[PDB]
Design a protein around this ligand. Structure first.
Ligand code: CA
Ligand code: CA
Ligand code: CA
Ligand code: CA
Lengths: 93, 93
């Protein structure tokens, strides 16, 4: 495929990175398709230290994002967080 | 000065791409059908390679039917693309 040899656009690569980051952190312990509270804290520390610099308690943040209260953040819950961050970014513009 | 992480820059790129295309014509905070077509063909040529008419896709995204894609409708599209990538990054065997 000719398009297969074309590098991802800057947007496509960014979207893919958002998704890969989730699985990179979610595979560290327990269920591989969900963030434990500790995996979530590592994600924030490692990858979201600036955008979430003023979020306050990460334990509480975990709780608010865990909308189905199952103690884990599956991709859809993680995605909701990314949306919240994107909205904040949109406002700095 | 505190430099962004890979994840943070990726999220920022998704937001800035929207505005880069929305400022072209009419309202600068929303995509006309024409700006949407250019964002897709320019910046989403792989991820939306197998998309049909762009005129219909625009209709599907424009949920409030006002012929403009504001950031939240564009975000819905990003979520869709993210979900598909997610399925690939976490293959069930
Ligand atoms: Ca896990
Ligand atoms: Ca949950
Ligand atoms: Ca516009
Ligand atoms: Ca609309």
């Amino acid at each position: 495929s000719l398009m297969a040899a074309e590098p991802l656009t800057e947007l496509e690569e960014s979207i893919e990175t958002v998704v890969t980051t989730f699985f990179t952190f979610a595979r560290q312990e327990g269920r591989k398709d969900s963030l434990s509270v500790n995996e979530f804290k590592e994600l924030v520390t490692q990858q979201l230290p600036h955008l979430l610099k003023d979020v306050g308690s990460l334990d509480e943040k975990m709780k608010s994002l865990d909308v189905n209260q199952d103690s884990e953040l599956k991709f859809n819950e993680y995605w909701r967080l990314i949306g919240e961050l994107a909205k904040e970014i949109r406002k700095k513009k």
